[PDB]
Design an enzyme around this catalytic site. Structure first.
Site, PDB file in Angstrom:
ATOM      1  N   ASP A  53     -10.680  -7.604 -12.307  1.00 48.43           N
ATOM      2  CA  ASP A  53      -9.519  -6.938 -12.864  1.00 48.43           C
ATOM      3  C   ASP A  53      -8.395  -7.941 -12.981  1.00 48.43           C
ATOM      4  O   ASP A  53      -8.459  -9.030 -12.422  1.00 48.43           O
ATOM      5  CB  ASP A  53      -9.075  -5.758 -11.984  1.00 48.43           C
ATOM      6  CG  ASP A  53      -9.379  -4.398 -12.620  1.00 48.43           C
ATOM      7  OD1 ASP A  53      -8.907  -3.358 -12.090  1.00 48.43           O
ATOM      8  OD2 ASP A  53     -10.081  -4.377 -13.663  1.00 48.43           O
ATOM      9  N   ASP A  55      -4.349  -6.862 -12.757  1.00 49.76           N
ATOM     10  CA  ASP A  55      -3.315  -5.837 -12.764  1.00 49.76           C
ATOM     11  C   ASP A  55      -2.007  -6.547 -12.502  1.00 49.76           C
ATOM     12  O   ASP A  55      -1.998  -7.568 -11.833  1.00 49.76           O
ATOM     13  CB  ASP A  55      -3.577  -4.823 -11.656  1.00 49.76           C
ATOM     14  CG  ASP A  55      -5.062  -4.559 -11.441  1.00 49.76           C
ATOM     15  OD1 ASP A  55      -5.638  -5.134 -10.484  1.00 49.76           O
ATOM     16  OD2 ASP A  55      -5.656  -3.783 -12.227  1.00 49.76           O
ATOM     17  N   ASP A 112      -2.327  -1.240   0.731  1.00 54.25           N
ATOM     18  CA  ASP A 112      -3.205  -1.060   1.886  1.00 54.25           C
ATOM     19  C   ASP A 112      -3.480  -2.314   2.712  1.00 54.25           C
ATOM     20  O   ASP A 112      -2.743  -2.600   3.650  1.00 54.25           O
ATOM     21  CB  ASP A 112      -4.540  -0.466   1.438  1.00 54.25           C
ATOM     22  CG  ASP A 112      -4.374   0.827   0.676  1.00 54.25           C
ATOM     23  OD1 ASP A 112      -3.219   1.242   0.459  1.00 54.25           O
ATOM     24  OD2 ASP A 112      -5.400   1.427   0.296  1.00 54.25           O
TER      25      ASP A 112
END
Ligand SMILES: Nc1ncnc2c1ncn2[C@@H]1O[C@H](COP(=O)(O)OP(=O)(O)OP(=O)(O)O)[C@@H](O)[C@H]1O
Ligand SMILES: Nc1ncnc2c1ncn2[C@@H]1O[C@H](COP(=O)(O)OP(=O)(O)OP(=O)(O)O)[C@@H](O)[C@H]1O
Ligand SMILES: [Mg+2]
Ligand SMILES: [Mg+2]
Lengths: 388, 388
Positions: A53, A55, A112
């Site tokens: 990915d 992002d 997280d």
């Protein structure tokens, strides 16, 4: 503590391995905004490995990102989180959070784990480490960010991810981050069956499955999701079911790495198999009725109480029902309807179940059915006729 | 002379074996018009076999028919030729013909053969025979209606049909109706390649193929359709390509009598394979290209020419090309790139063609890539892993 890392001390994280979401930041950086590349890939890049990915994040409000991209193909809302489309590359542009929209440091804390919270600036080739991050990443440590105890209660699924990453990369969980899980695992049932379903696939149906299963068993995270399954475990360690599950995983895994697609309706139909079989036994000898109709009941229930934890979409279940259906039909050595069967859309899967059932039970009479169907499907029509 | 034959003396084609397109005649009959069953079915019904279609004919104006079915699910277009839907059942409701239309007798005449122009009324259980019809049906005789010579000229395809019914049913072609064919055959080149494609499939792809090619060759009707192949026949009779076209048809036939989906694009790649294997080798030496580049030209070439006779859908040509291409790849004893292949949407047909190629060439070298790909395609990823 080391908050900003330079491109010369930081594993090269070479601007050129970043594809062209770079066009998406440059646009922001030009507008007087900030462009950071967060989490997944930015981890991987430091690792050396290829990002899956890309992002990004910005101090630009979501309505500000709207104007600066109104000319672009912006795919679907959400709150915050804007979606830019190239095509087979889609780029996520999210605003920093904090009252609502805040600083980079702010955003870092609501993320997280440590490594999944590293930031890159094309603008200065520096990576920002407001967390353990850099070290955790080197030492190979999946660490959580705030107070584990509280986070897991706010979003219990945070626990599931810890294992998932633990398995994916060669990393181990921080002690503080691990202590709470076995105790807090039960908390997963206060989770909407749908969200779970997603994560069940994120874990197994992601090409790590097997290592992520070991880890889900060693933290009592497996049980909450697949009650219907834990129950048939045995002290001995490896019952037919306790092997099959390891195999269908190990394999689904091989598939995903040799880049093959994979059927989830399969994965499941495999695991629950033996449980279904067992319910066929009780359903039969008790409440004495035919073995066909008996089996058919075991289906509804097993799928019922399983669909009670994971929310499996009607689509999948219905193929599953078929994969099992074929297991009985195939068993009865017979003629002309073998063409009718060979044609079935879920045959391929159904044959791969028979594949396993025979490998695990080592029932030579099964593998026997396995050679026959094996050849009756690669064989050409003149032979396929003679096979009957 | 013997024009009306009663329920008892006529193979009882029994009202019970008419699908409830009776409900459509009933409306017609109740409404002052008469309505009869024609050809396709009534033939098979008198032969005993299950009809595959029921078409009714009426003396109601296409206008009168339009009105008396308004409430109904009547699907559109087609002068005369009205259409009504149920489930999987469509009922064809055309008006007689003869300024334009007229007597049930006047219709019996514009129809191509004697059998396919028998008429059944549910209202009186009689069948009306205004041609040889009945006798011919008894006798096993395909017999064009009026003057063969003129009719063939009016519609050259009437020739193809004639040869098709000849092979489908178990019967011989009327002397008077066979003579003109070998002569008039070429006439087909005047026909839009569209119709020829359509009718090309009713001949080989209806699972009578082999018998319908024994005829198409024995009446020089084959040539007008498949120039590119005709050219490569050998007086010997036993060239690889000649054996291949036999087998593929024999097999397509089998596939159809056991209710298995059949692929058109396969059919073709199979026949033209050898003409493609030939044009490639000739393009290889005559012009010193690489084989891979050579082959690709040949593909274009064979296609354009066949396309010159049969209007083969841009759809099916793509698939075909691929089925062929795959034959280059399956050749190289390929490594981990083989997983990708196994996945190809066509691999089944490409396999099925390697299947034939190996069988007809009676080549062991090829016969090995067959035994191999047979296993590598049914094995488990463990096993499959190893094979590679
Ligand atoms: N409920 C939540 N609470 C806090 N942070 C969250 C939550 N959901 C997502 N995040 C943040 O989103 C980021 C993860 O992004 P994403 O969900 O795309 O997975 P990823 O980190 O790219 O995983 P992978 O390593 O498999 O690519 C993490 O940094 C995490 O901190
Ligand atoms: N161009 C044409 N000229 C004259 N008659 C035609 C023409 N097209 C069709 N017909 C008539 O239509 C009838 C055939 O109907 P259809 O096309 O459904 O095939 P069929 O006879 O049912 O074939 P099968 O035996 O394969 O079922 C024949 O009786 C034929 O006389
Ligand atoms: Mg995310
Ligand atoms: Mg018709």
């Amino acid at each position: 503590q080391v908050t900003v890392i330079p491109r010369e001390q930081h594993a090269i994280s070479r601007k050129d391995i970043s594809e062209n979401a770079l066009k998406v930041m440059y646009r922001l950086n030009k507008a007087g905004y900030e462009a950071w590349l967060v989490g997944g890939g930015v981890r991987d890049l430091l690792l050396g490995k290829k990002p899956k990915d890309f992002d990004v994040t910005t101090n630009a409000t979501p309505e500000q990102v709207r104007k600066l991209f109104r000319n672009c193909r912006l795919v679907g809302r959400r709150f915050r989180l804007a979606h830019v489309m190239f095509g087979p590359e889609i780029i996520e542009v999210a605003t920093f959070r904090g009252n609502i929209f805040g600083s980079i440091e702010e955003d870092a804390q609501r993320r997280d784990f440590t490594i999944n919270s590293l930031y890159y600036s094309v603008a200065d080739f520096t990576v920002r480490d407001y967390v353990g991050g850099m070290k955790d990443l080197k030492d190979g440590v999946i660490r959580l960010i705030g107070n584990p105890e509280t986070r897991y209660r706010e979003d219990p699924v945070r626990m599931l991810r810890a294992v998932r990453f633990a398995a994916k990369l060669g990393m181990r969980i921080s002690p503080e981050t691990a202590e709470p899980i076995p105790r807090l695992a039960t908390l997963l049932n206060d989770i909407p069956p749908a969200h779970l379903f997603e994560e069940s696939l994120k874990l197994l149906q992601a090409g790590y499955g097997y290592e992520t299963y070991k880890l889900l068993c060693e933290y009592h995270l497996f049980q909450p999701l697949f009650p219907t399954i834990t129950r048939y475990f045995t002290e001995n360690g490896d019952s037919p079911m306790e092997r099959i599950i390891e195999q269908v995983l190990k394999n689904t895994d091989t598939r995903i790495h040799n880049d093959m697609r994979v059927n989830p309706a399969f994965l499941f139909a495999a695991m629950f198999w033996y449980p279904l079989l067992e319910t066929a036994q009780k359903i039969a000898q008790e409440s004495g009725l035919t073995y066909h109709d008996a089996f058919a009941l075991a289906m509804n229930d097993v799928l019922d109480e399983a669909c009670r934890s994971l929310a499996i979409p009607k689509r999948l279940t219905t193929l599953t029902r078929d994969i099992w259906q074929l297991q009985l039909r195939m068993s009865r050595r017979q003629g002309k309807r073998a063409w009718k069967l060979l044609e079935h859309p879920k045959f391929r899967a159904a044959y791969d179940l028979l594949a396993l059932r025979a490998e695990v039970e080592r029932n030579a009479e099964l593998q026997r059915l396995v050679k026959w169907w094996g050849e009756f499907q690669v064989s050409a029509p003149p032979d396929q006729k003679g096979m009957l």
